[PDB]
Symmetry: D2
Subunit: 247 residues, 4 copies
């Protein structure tokens, strides 16, 4: 007889999601990036052994860093990410908190915020608040490492990417697109998945602010750190912003 | 900071669903329809006390009929519907089975299939199979009552309907549309719901066959029942098809 | 034979749309709101005869205001809205421009921005830029009227609304929901429409900033206007912010 | 300022579509399949020079066949396909008609229906009608070639496929899934496309009937053709059904 077909769609706000972050992570060199942090910190703070990673996602960078920085922690707003990070690490707490205003009641030799995550900040004032909150988790001589998002100058229009993962009984395809709006880059990601249970379609739209170099350096100085822009680490044409907390 | 937005959509086959059937049921006169069945059965079988309702949905017609037909049962393919019907009734079994070929190992004084449900049959042969399976659950003198779907002649193009249910902290709206394809009516139903958890969109597309009067009467005769078409019960311009099982 | 079913979905950025604004407008008292503007302007500027409406949408408020302010204009970023407004008005130009930084090369006795449209501004600095751009289209003694969006204090969580319009051969239903995120209200609107051509589903998600009273008054003062908050016009519990441009 | 995001979705019935058929066609060996037809026809009808391809899609098989069968035609129900086929061919008419009941007022040395297209027939009676309509476009000695869809025995559960086409400024990904329902295979195809205009999602669900070998052979015999099943041409484990029209 005739058999109906159906769909259900649910819509809402989104934060870090396990599989999404797994999936994005596939061609990503967590090792190289952890190395940037280790190197820039140890140059400025040779004995550094404690580290906080702010908006740490799945905790994968921490899994690299902890060999060098055995007294480590994470901060993640997404309950799902926080639980997945904590599962993956050993005796490394991951705290559920807002990068924009958090306080853990301790300091660390280094604080990092990686892969442009700081550009969830919507404006310069909010950027400054995040960098301040990071800086108060440092002692004098502590190192603050920001892997910035793109600037208005360096953001490239026209980006489109896809990926495919074909497993046993399950295939997932991904397509993504980005475009500029004012001083925001808007990122669209769509997934289709198919297995024995059926087909699913997932989508997410997220904005990141395009801050010029001056705004990052400024945020560092206002947070009581001596600001550097380093171009021999980080991604080409963006580099890293580093601050050493001043007495 | 910036907060992403997201959607997840899942696609699959659909059978009877609790809320959907609740919702459809709102202006529906279960009482009037149960009365058609009671009346047509008692005219032909004055002592009738047992009844089987095939594709019984939520079991609401059975809840009316059981006062008159205290030894009752249902058949429902949808596990969700079967469980909801059984919950609503007292000591009335609802069996998970296919109306097209089922066998319960007993007979009943009457068998019904209501609200056009028989027109899930895709063709005349399948219609005949359903009516046969119904007819073998009757003794000699048993009454088979079919509330047919529309025929090619009587189906009306242009149907569009909507409903709204506005509760405390939750609103659901529904919009539906139907159109003819060959000898099939295709029914589209969309829902939007919104509460504190967010917004959801649901959709379903289902076909029903448009059988002419002759095909229903034929199915009855081939199932060993004496066929009637009754026009003073059932919906205007379609009536009911009734069969009395013959020795 | 079997006939496939299908969907196509397109995703993108959205500005003012004709039918959407028609639809929203249905219970809206354009007359009352135009009256607020007329009254507050004529109290402060008895001879006022020219008016600019910034983010004017369909131009419906202008259609009321022009009897009183016969030398009028609009500003609208959405090409569709701009064309629809201009169609509806007589000899009233509607300019395609950004409310945040526009210059028409003239002044007007009054400038307004209605129904919370100013709260497309993402932060206080951007609010100040819009109000400045408005204020430079005023002479000394000119009146700037802002119908603000809600403040953090006055925004009400839990809003859900629906509408239905049932025409000949066409029905449109609408469902909307809003919630607070930080100092942003996020507004979701879904439509279903059905006619002889089929069924369509439309959705939009839009943010507005929740600015406290001080931020609006501040923006006025920094734009060289003497700031008032008026509570006997505008919506209950929000009022209007008015500025008189100072020499 | 804040910029809304939006989606529009339209739902309806679907027939052959140009890009979809392009896309499906990518790993398809039109040449091999045209060769099956040529070979089976010329074995039985050495002088054969005229051919009709029923449900011809884009006309690509015809573009191969016409070298051998220069007096050719197509039948296609989809206006879009019919126009695209006719564009691609030279002086080969493609008629808009229903494969289930059409009459072109001539015969051809051969009639084919390829890539399982005949299994749009919903039941045996409809299959027989299509094969009859094909057979009356043949003279005595004419060859009818059917590339059948899968049978209940040979249909394989678990099929999932994907494709990707990455062009300059445009990427399209495709994911498909099939499953069995009663004697129907249900096919779901989803596409995501992204270019400078945005992202689009397309989906289609289509049923094909699973007929056993006997039903195809039967249809041939009832259409006045001598039936063969050939296993050294066509796809492995399904072969071709061929009929020679009898005096
Ligand atoms: N306000 C906030 N505070 C803390 N974490 C946040 C946040 N807003 C977003 N995030 C998190 O930031 C992460 C960005 S995804 C990438 C995370 C990681 N640094 C990496 O390089 O792999 C998400 O996991 C999201 O949950
Ligand atoms: N093959 C099958 N066998 C049994 N029930 C079926 C079926 N195909 C569909 N149905 C059921 O038929 C019902 C149609 S909805 C209406 C049911 C009920 N007779 C009424 O009048 O209210 C659905 O609950 C669905 O689950
Ligand atoms: N940056 C910008 N500049 C000008 N208009 C804008 C804008 N951003 C959004 N808008 C417009 O602002 C309008 C908000 S809708 C309501 C408009 C109208 N004032 C009313 O009360 O009816 C939309 O038409 C949208 O196109
Ligand atoms: N009833 C009908 N009559 C004619 N064509 C039909 C039809 N139902 C579906 N079709 C067409 O059948 C085609 C199936 S797609 C494949 C077509 C082609 N034989 C090939 O091998 O490439 C579609 O183009 C669709 O438009
Ligand atoms: C290399 C590079 C990538 N990208 C961006 C565009 C995409 O949105 C994103 C893909 O990782 O990276 C730039 O914006 N600039 C660059 O120089
Ligand atoms: C009254 C009536 C309703 N309908 C149909 C059209 C819709 O698909 C459905 C709504 O219940 O009923 C007919 O087809 N014919 C009729 O005579
Ligand atoms: C009356 C009133 C409406 N609303 C809002 C909630 C909804 O998002 C919107 C509906 O017009 O108005 C407030 O936020 N506060 C109020 O006092
Ligand atoms: C080879 C083969 C493919 N397939 C089907 C499953 C998929 O729905 C479809 C992919 O072309 O082909 C079979 O059903 N049986 C077979 O033997």
């Amino acid at each position: 007889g005739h058999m109906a077909v159906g769909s259900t769609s649910v819509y809402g706000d989104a934060l870090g999601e396990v599989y999404d972050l797994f999936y994005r992570g596939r061609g990503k060199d967590f090792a190289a990036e952890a190395e940037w942090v280790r190197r820039v910190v140890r140059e400025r703070r040779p004995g550094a052994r404690s580290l906080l990673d702010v908006a740490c996602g799945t905790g994968e960078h921490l899994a690299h860093l902890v060999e060098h920085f055995p007294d480590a922690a994470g901060v993640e707003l997404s309950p799902a990410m926080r639980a997945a990070a904590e599962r993956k690490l050993t005796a490394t707490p991951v705290h559920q908190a807002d990068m924009f205003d958090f306080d853990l009641g301790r300091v660390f030799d280094a604080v990092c915020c990686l892969t442009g995550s700081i550009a969830y900040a919507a404006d310069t004032a909010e950027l400054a608040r995040a960098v301040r909150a990071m800086a108060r988790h440092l002692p004098v001589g502590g190192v603050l490492v920001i892997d910035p998002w793109w600037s208005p100058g360096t953001f490239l229009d026209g980006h489109i990417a896809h990926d495919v993962v074909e497993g046993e009984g399950r295939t997932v395809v991904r397509l993504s697109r980005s475009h500029r709006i004012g001083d925001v880059s808007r990122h669209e990601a769509h997934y289709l998945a198919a297995d024995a249970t059926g087909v699913r379609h997932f989508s997410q739209v997220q904005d990141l602010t395009l801050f010029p170099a001056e705004d990052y350096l400024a945020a560092l100085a206002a947070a009581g750190c001596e600001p550097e822009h380093l171009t021999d680490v980080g991604q080409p044409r963006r580099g890293l912003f580093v601050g050493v907390r001043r007495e």
